[PDB]
Design a protein around this ligand. Structure first.
Ligand SMILES: [Mg+2]
Ligand SMILES: [Mg+2]
Ligand SMILES: [Mg+2]
Ligand SMILES: [Mg+2]
Ligand SMILES: [Mg+2]
Ligand SMILES: [Mg+2]
Ligand SMILES: [Mg+2]
Ligand SMILES: [Mg+2]
Ligand SMILES: [Mg+2]
Ligand SMILES: [Mg+2]
Ligand SMILES: [Mg+2]
Ligand SMILES: [Mg+2]
Ligand SMILES: [Mg+2]
Ligand SMILES: [Mg+2]
Ligand SMILES: [Mg+2]
Ligand SMILES: [Mg+2]
Ligand SMILES: [Mg+2]
Ligand SMILES: [Mg+2]
Ligand SMILES: [Mg+2]
Ligand SMILES: [Mg+2]
Ligand SMILES: [Mg+2]
Ligand SMILES: [Mg+2]
Ligand SMILES: [Mg+2]
Ligand SMILES: [Mg+2]
Ligand SMILES: [Mg+2]
Ligand SMILES: [Mg+2]
Ligand SMILES: [Mg+2]
Ligand SMILES: [Mg+2]
Ligand SMILES: [Mn+2]
Ligand SMILES: [Mn+2]
Ligand SMILES: [Mn+2]
Ligand SMILES: [Mn+2]
Ligand SMILES: [Mn+2]
Ligand SMILES: [Mn+2]
Ligand SMILES: [Mn+2]
Ligand SMILES: [Mn+2]
Ligand SMILES: [Mn+2]
Ligand SMILES: [Mn+2]
Ligand SMILES: [Mn+2]
Ligand SMILES: [Mn+2]
Ligand SMILES: [Mn+2]
Ligand SMILES: [Mn+2]
Ligand SMILES: [Mn+2]
Ligand SMILES: [Mn+2]
Ligand SMILES: [Mn+2]
Ligand SMILES: [Mn+2]
Ligand SMILES: [Mn+2]
Ligand SMILES: [Mn+2]
Ligand SMILES: [Mn+2]
Ligand SMILES: [Mn+2]
Ligand SMILES: [Mn+2]
Ligand SMILES: [Mn+2]
Ligand SMILES: [Mn+2]
Ligand SMILES: [Mn+2]
Ligand SMILES: [Mn+2]
Ligand SMILES: [Mn+2]
Ligand SMILES: [Mn+2]
Ligand SMILES: [Mn+2]
Ligand SMILES: [Mn+2]
Ligand SMILES: [Mn+2]
Ligand SMILES: [Mn+2]
Ligand SMILES: [Mn+2]
Ligand SMILES: [Mn+2]
Ligand SMILES: [Mn+2]
Ligand SMILES: [Mn+2]
Ligand SMILES: [Mn+2]
Ligand SMILES: [Mn+2]
Ligand SMILES: [Mn+2]
Ligand SMILES: [Mn+2]
Ligand SMILES: [Mn+2]
Ligand SMILES: [Mn+2]
Ligand SMILES: [Mn+2]
Ligand SMILES: [Mn+2]
Ligand SMILES: [Mn+2]
Ligand SMILES: [Mn+2]
Ligand SMILES: [Mn+2]
Ligand SMILES: [Mn+2]
Ligand SMILES: [Mn+2]
Lengths: 45, 102, 116, 145, 49, 112, 150
RNA sequence: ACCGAUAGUGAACCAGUACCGUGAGGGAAAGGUGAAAAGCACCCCGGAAGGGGAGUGAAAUAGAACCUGAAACCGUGUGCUUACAAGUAGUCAGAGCCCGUUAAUGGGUGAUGGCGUGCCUUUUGUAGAAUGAACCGGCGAGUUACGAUUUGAUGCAAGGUU
RNA sequence: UAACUUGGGAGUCAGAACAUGGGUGAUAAGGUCCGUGUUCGAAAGGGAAACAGCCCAGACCACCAGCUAAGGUCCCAAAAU
RNA sequence: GACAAUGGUAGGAGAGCGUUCUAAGGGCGUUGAAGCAUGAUCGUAAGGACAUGUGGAGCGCUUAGAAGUGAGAAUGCCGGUG
């Protein structure tokens, strides 16, 4: 099966509104500097 | 007050002092024209022409003798290979009114 | 002498595109599509200019019908009586009168009931 | 575009009117009320806007028919499911809440335009004699022949 | 007749006709329809059947 | 004035780079670097290096205070694209587009 | 034309089965780098006129120069000079033909004056006679024109 | 009164060459910085690529994939607008908001109302569910030679013409 | 208010419905074959809900003027509750 | 100045627009040509100008002459991009 008519720039963009990526949940290292991902390790300091 | 002068092919309700537009009068640009057909006269003390309120007249200074914006007149018949395109600009006379029934 | 393409086609086409302005997406962009929408546009406007003359006459007439009903008289009889009295006023006029001067329209009406 | 007047929602006003349905035939009430709802009965009428007045029909329960419309007149309906013409109800079933009788009947005499759909929201029907809507202070309205 | 002003005799020379150059021109099928406006165009020089 | 920097013909497709770019756009430069370091997409390190270089010559060249800096604008544009194939069944080949893109970032203070 | 172009003669693909257009040659006119349809080819561009007509043209041109301004002169001198420019002390204008009776080489090497052209009368073309602006026949050549073109 | 880089040779470039076929054989694409290499010393971010300064230059918004740099196509910013509405997308009517012209009874947007089934081909008849076209660009079809005939024009004329 | 003569250039030789006089079929066909008339083809506009062939009527162009035709006049929807 | 006519497929007749080159005249151009872009400009149509930006060296106008002279469709060819 093939598309029977080309998608318009408008249709194709409407189809894409949900296709983002969410900004990662993140938190400041207490007194270390570089921030890290939530409930994840604080690294080597 | 009101006019209801019959100035083009059409009736026109003029109020005196308001510039109006009408199909061209071919009278020179500065000159004063008078409208000799007045069908009605409003405000206080109305006269109702049947037709033309008799002797009543509207006076108007001529303002301009222009032609309106071009309108292309395009047209076609599908699957028949025919079309016509004609430009058109309809000539007019703009003029301010002054003194109704005068 | 060979003659090359050059300018001409592009200016013809660009003319056509600029002609197509409020148009939806590809209708304002591609020459083929836009040429078609402009052609049809011309035809539509040509007929519409003619019909518009009617579409206003009817609106006037309904306003007259209303103003007449208000004085307990149908538009049919109002126009017949205005004819018989020889009033020869316009419909656009008769209605703008009914809007901007009730006393006057009432007077014309009374003129119309007379000679009926 | 020489000089024709066009009313708008800055140059407009719409009153509230009450209408007693008892003793009235359905259709001949309905048409009249529809024209009321549309603004057809004023010289300020102008097609691209709603210039109509508000209408409350009252004693909707007492609207009456001709013929054997108590029977014979069937109102259909379809659910968009197969065999779904759940459809039939006798026109007689104005006993079953008839605010819908008059509402549907008038509403079907208004244009399908979205403006027309909003024009039809100015209707208010009640089978009872009292209506909630005093405050809007409706004037009573004679039903012309 | 100053050579930057030459003019041909008042009745001499009409412009040549170019078929197949648009629809307004009045030729675009060019001429005929559907039959032996094919290129060989052989009505065999003088004959019927 | 308010400084910028650009990386050209990075070999990531523009659709892909743009996803990471949207998170960063309009943000304070510090948290922009954070979101960049944590977002685990392929374009993130590249975009990071670009934003770093941008803040860098925003200081060494135009001598702005680095900490007050904001990501005024970021985007990616189609670059030239390398064109390759991919042999298929029945012996047909078919197109593949290794696309590339120009990434741009512009940091800022106040108007003047 | 397509018969000329360096290729051709194998069908690019079978008629049917391809989902492509029919094609016969890679050099057919709608192809890039294909043959040309009805291009220019070499040919004459030259035509006969009745002889009397040519003579009429000539009288017409000469008498044209006469009805405006076409002057007549003594005759020639020596070897090779830009003293011909000095010769239009006689006050000829920017475009001129000298008309010698028969090949006055030397008068002929009054040439690279910007816009002057001398021939013998046995020549005397309608064109040269026409861009002309101001002609100068001398006398021998003038009488020879009058002899031949009567 | 031939071409001017899809032209003109197949070949303006180390063409009968990349490439393809066992072979005979088939057979491309690909020209342009600047007047001058003066082809960006040096500082900076980067492993590099690439970039911002600083410089060369009339110009690098001429920086080498380099004259001009159209369209399709991809993006970033926003002025008007849009989540009760059935749309060949426009046209006619028209409020609101924003703007200020090759100043003329101006420009952008458009709540809402009227009307409204693309184009081409081919057909008695096509919105057609009959054909064709993804889109944009370039290129792509009555010509020339000779003869015949007819009309117009010009010269002579019982002659005209080589 | 045309007609005919001579010459240059043509296109056409698939027709369609409706009405009507008829053959064929079954006083079947949106059938078929002839006669006559209109319309379509090549005809936009109004009516017949929509609807080449029906009814009214033939668009040089602009107008927010008027009278009409077929068809209409409670509401959708112009006009007689 | 009245008056009449002006729907149209195949098709016949007419008058014109624009493109490249040529001839002659007359001009513009680094104080910025062609080209490209934008605009609320003009003509009954094809089409013609003007201003601003870009561009960096060529080009109009008039009269005539000659044509590889006008593209949206060929499951057309090449290229780019969806
Ligand atoms: Mg719009
Ligand atoms: Mg057009
Ligand atoms: Mg009952
Ligand atoms: Mg033929
Ligand atoms: Mg073959
Ligand atoms: Mg000498
Ligand atoms: Mg020649
Ligand atoms: Mg083999
Ligand atoms: Mg470093
Ligand atoms: Mg380093
Ligand atoms: Mg610099
Ligand atoms: Mg630089
Ligand atoms: Mg409007
Ligand atoms: Mg609309
Ligand atoms: Mg003759
Ligand atoms: Mg003769
Ligand atoms: Mg019969
Ligand atoms: Mg029969
Ligand atoms: Mg018949
Ligand atoms: Mg019709
Ligand atoms: Mg039709
Ligand atoms: Mg309706
Ligand atoms: Mg020009
Ligand atoms: Mg100029
Ligand atoms: Mg400049
Ligand atoms: Mg322009
Ligand atoms: Mg010519
Ligand atoms: Mg094509
Ligand atoms: Mn998006
Ligand atoms: Mn072309
Ligand atoms: Mn609907
Ligand atoms: Mn012609
Ligand atoms: Mn024709
Ligand atoms: Mn054909
Ligand atoms: Mn034929
Ligand atoms: Mn052949
Ligand atoms: Mn034979
Ligand atoms: Mn294989
Ligand atoms: Mn060959
Ligand atoms: Mn295919
Ligand atoms: Mn070639
Ligand atoms: Mn050339
Ligand atoms: Mn080549
Ligand atoms: Mn080129
Ligand atoms: Mn060089
Ligand atoms: Mn470097
Ligand atoms: Mn410099
Ligand atoms: Mn490039
Ligand atoms: Mn460039
Ligand atoms: Mn809403
Ligand atoms: Mn529907
Ligand atoms: Mn509709
Ligand atoms: Mn065509
Ligand atoms: Mn189709
Ligand atoms: Mn077929
Ligand atoms: Mn297709
Ligand atoms: Mn026959
Ligand atoms: Mn037949
Ligand atoms: Mn029958
Ligand atoms: Mn039949
Ligand atoms: Mn008979
Ligand atoms: Mn036909
Ligand atoms: Mn019709
Ligand atoms: Mn006819
Ligand atoms: Mn109709
Ligand atoms: Mn029907
Ligand atoms: Mn209809
Ligand atoms: Mn009647
Ligand atoms: Mn009504
Ligand atoms: Mn005609
Ligand atoms: Mn007519
Ligand atoms: Mn012809
Ligand atoms: Mn300068
Ligand atoms: Mn040129
Ligand atoms: Mn010039
Ligand atoms: Mn061509
Ligand atoms: Mn194409
Ligand atoms: Mn392709």
């Amino acid at each position: 099966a093939v598309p029977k008519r080309r998608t318009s720039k408008t249709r194709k963009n409407k189809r894409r509104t949900h296709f983002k990526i969410s900004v990662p949940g993140m938190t400041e290292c207490p007194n270390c500097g570089r921030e890290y991902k939530l409930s994840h390790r604080v690294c080597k300091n | 007050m009101f006019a209801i002068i019959e100035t083009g092919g059409k009736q026109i309700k003029v109020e005196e002092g308001q510039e109006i537009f009408v199909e061209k009068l071919d009278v020179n640009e500065g000159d004063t024209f008078t409208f000799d057909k007045v069908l009605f006269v409003g405000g206080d003390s109305v006269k109702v022409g049947a037709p033309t309120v008799e002797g009543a007249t509207v006076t108007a200074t001529v303002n301009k003798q222009g032609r309106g914006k071009k309108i292309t007149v395009f047209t076609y018949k599908r699957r028949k290979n025919s079309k016509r395109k004609k430009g058109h600009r309809q000539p007019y006379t703009k003029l301010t009114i002054d003194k109704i029934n005068a | 002498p060979r003659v090359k393409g050059g300018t001409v086609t592009r200016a013809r086409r660009k003319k056509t595109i600029k002609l197509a302005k409020g148009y939806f997406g590809s209708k304002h962009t591609l020459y083929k599509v836009a040429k078609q929408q402009v052609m049809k546009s011309g035809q539509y406007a040509f007929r519409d200019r003619r019909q518009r003359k009617r579409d206003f006459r009817k609106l006037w007439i309904t306003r007259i019908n209303a103003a007449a009903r208000q004085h307990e008289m149908s538009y049919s009889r109002l126009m017949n009586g205005l004819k018989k009295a020889g009033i020869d006023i316009n419909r656009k006029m008769l209605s703008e009168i009914a809007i901007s001067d009730e006393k006057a329209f009432a007077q014309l009406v009374t003129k119309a009931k007379d000679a009926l | 575009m020489r000089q024709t007047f066009m009313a708008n929602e800055s140059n407009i006003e719409r009153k509230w009117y009450v209408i007693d349905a008892e003793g009235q035939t359905l259709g001949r009430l309905s048409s009249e009320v529809a024209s009321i709802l549309r603004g057809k009965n004023k010289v300020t009428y102008t097609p691209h806007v709603d210039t109509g007045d508000y209408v409350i029909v009252i004693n909707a329960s007492k609207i009456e028919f001709t013929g054997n419309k108590e029977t014979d007149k069937v109102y259909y309906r379809h659910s968009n499911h197969p065999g779904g013409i759940k459809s039939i109800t006798a026109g007689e079933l104005r006993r079953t809440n008839p605010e819908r009788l008059i509402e549907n009947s008038i509403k079907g005499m208004l244009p399908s335009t979205r403006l027309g759909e909003k024009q039809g929201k100015k209707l208010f029907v009640y089978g009872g004699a009292e209506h909630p809507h005093a405050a809007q202070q409706p004037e009573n309205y004679e039903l012309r022949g | 007749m100053k050579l930057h002003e030459l003019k041909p005799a008042e009745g001499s020379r009409k412009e040549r006709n170019r078929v197949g150059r648009g629809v307004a021109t009045g030729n675009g099928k060019t001429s005929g329809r559907g039959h032996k406006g094919q290129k060989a165009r052989s009505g065999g020089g003088v004959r019927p059947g | 004035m308010e400084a910028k920097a650009v990386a050209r013909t990075i070999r990531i497709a523009p659709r892909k780079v743009r996803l990471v770019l949207d998170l960063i756009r309009g943000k304070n430069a510090a948290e922009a670097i954070a979101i960049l370091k944590l977002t685990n997409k392929a374009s993130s390190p590249v975009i990071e290096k670009v934003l770093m270089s941008a803040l860098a010559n925003a200081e060494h060249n135009y001598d702005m205070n680095t900490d007050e800096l904001v990501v005024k604008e970021a985007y990616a544009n189609e670059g030239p694209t390398l064109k390759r194939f991919r042999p298929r069944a029945q012996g047909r080949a078919s197109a593949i587009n290794k696309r590339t893109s120009h990434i741009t970032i512009v940091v800022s203070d106040g108007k003047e | 034309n397509r018969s000329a172009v360096s290729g051709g003669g194998r069908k690019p693909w079978k008629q049917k089965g391809t989902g492509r257009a029919r094609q016969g040659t890679i050099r057919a006119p709608q192809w890039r780098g294909g043959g040309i349809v009805f291009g220019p080819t070499p040919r004459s561009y030259a035509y006969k006129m009745p002889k009397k007509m040519r003579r009429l043209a000539l009288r017409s041109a000469l008498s044209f120069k006469a009805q405006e301004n076409g002057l007549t002169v003594v005759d020639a001198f020596n070897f090779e000079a830009p003293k011909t420019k000095e010769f239009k002390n006689v006050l000829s204008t920017l475009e001129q033909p000298k008309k010698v009776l028969v090949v006055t080489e030397n008068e002929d090497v009054n040439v690279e004056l910007s816009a002057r052209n001398i021939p013998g009368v046995q020549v005397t073309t309608a064109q040269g006679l026409n861009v002309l602006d101001i002609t100068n026949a001398d006398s021998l050549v003038i009488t020879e024109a009058a002899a031949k073109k009567v």
